[PDB]
Design a protein around this ligand. Structure first.
Ligand SMILES: CC[C@@]1(c2ccccc2)C2=C(CC(C)(C)CC2=O)Nc2n[nH]cc21
Length: 335
């Protein structure tokens, strides 16, 4: 068809562009950022997402700077990036394409008034925390964890975190904006306006994702930035003055009463260790990866419903173990 040909720096490593060609460019999605397209590489047929952003020639692009540093089985690959052109200049990110997301698959089950089975919950949640461990190890917060940004191949069961459009490297020094994350998955410290929040916001959002996978709908659907807070109180109860200080009247409805009757205790526990008001009292991605809930994935006779083996869950790097390498003994069992 129309066959566009550009000179694209690869995302990985030495800064040396090569010629690259692609053809079936259909528009998908919009936003303050720019536009995302879908397309087909000629060299192989493989489908690609191309996010097209306006770039100030002087200033560096945060997403690209973050994406180039990343190489991890559970995160989208930036395959290439290339510039294009009034006297206006655009960055184009050429990203790996996966046709489904967790939101979409979850939405299938929800419409059948039906459960996503616990095995897929474990698999998906585990791989998520795993991608968080990795990006947190570079001080990078994602700041937009939600099912719509979890790529998923349902045959392999491989989940890959994506959209690093709100991602940012947090630094002890600097303030950062508090209106971020998508509203249902926003951490309570951010509703209270905090500008010194840590990577522990992602963990809350991972918690809101779990909760949702267990319930069939979002756990805290709020009307406004502000109602979001009331929807949390509804469940967590009112936070103590002490808790409120740590972030910077109603009784707490017990977790076990929150979910469906037949729900795993190990899962409900984990949920309560993620959805803590005090951000320091939330598990870290690696502590959660190691949480008892995920024990079924360390059984050597774990198989996927469709027969196949699980994807690789223990090829942990130095880097991913950075934050607490004792845990390697729990996370990596015998085999
Ligand atoms: C082309 C962009 C896309 C996306 C981008 C951001 C979030 C989620 C998905 C895209 C899909 C399939 C989709 C979820 C049906 C629609 C969609 O937006 N998969 C992707 N893989 N890489 C980028 C993508």
């Amino acid at each position: 068809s129309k066959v566009t040909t550009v000179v694209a720096t690869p995302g990985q490593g030495p800064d040396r562009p090569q010629e690259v060609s692609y053809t079936d460019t259909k528009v998908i999605g919009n936003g303050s950022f720019g536009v995302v397209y879908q397309a087909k590489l000629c060299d192989s047929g493989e489908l690609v997402a191309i996010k097209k952003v306006l770039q100030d020639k002087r200033f560096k692009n945060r997403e690209l700077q973050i994406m180039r540093k990343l190489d991890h089985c559970n995160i989208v690959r930036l395959r290439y990036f290339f510039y294009s052109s009034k006297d206006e200049v655009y960055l184009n990110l050429v990203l790996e394409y996966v046709p489904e997301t967790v939101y979409r698959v979850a939405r299938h089950y929800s419409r059948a008034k039906q459960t996503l089975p616990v095995i897929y919950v474990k698999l998906y949640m585990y791989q998520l925390f795993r991608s968080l461990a990795y990006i947190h190890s570079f001080g990078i917060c994602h700041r937009d964890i939600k099912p719509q940004n979890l790529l998923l191949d349902p045959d392999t069961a491989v989940l890959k975190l994506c959209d690093f459009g709100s991602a940012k490297q947090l630094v002890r020094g600097e303030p950062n904006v508090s209106y971020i994350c998508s509203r249902y998955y926003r951490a309570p410290e951010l509703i209270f306006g905090a500008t010194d929040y840590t990577s522990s916001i992602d963990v809350w959002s991972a918690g809101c994702v779990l909760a949702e996978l267990l319930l069939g709908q979002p756990i805290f659907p709020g009307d406004s930035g502000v109602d979001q807070l009331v929807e949390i109180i509804k469940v967590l109860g009112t936070p103590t003055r002490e808790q409120i200080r740590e972030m910077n009247q109603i009784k707490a409805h017990p977790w076990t009463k929150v979910f469906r009757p037949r729900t795993p205790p190990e899962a409900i526990a984990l949920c309560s260790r993620l959805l803590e008001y005090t951000p320091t009292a939330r598990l870290t991605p690696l502590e959660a990866c190691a949480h008892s809930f995920f024990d079924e994935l360390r059984d050597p006779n774990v198989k996927l419903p469709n027969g196949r083996d699980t994807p690789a869950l223990f090829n942990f790097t130095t880097q991913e173990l950075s934050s607490n390498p004792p845990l390697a003994t729990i996370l990596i069992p015998p085999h």
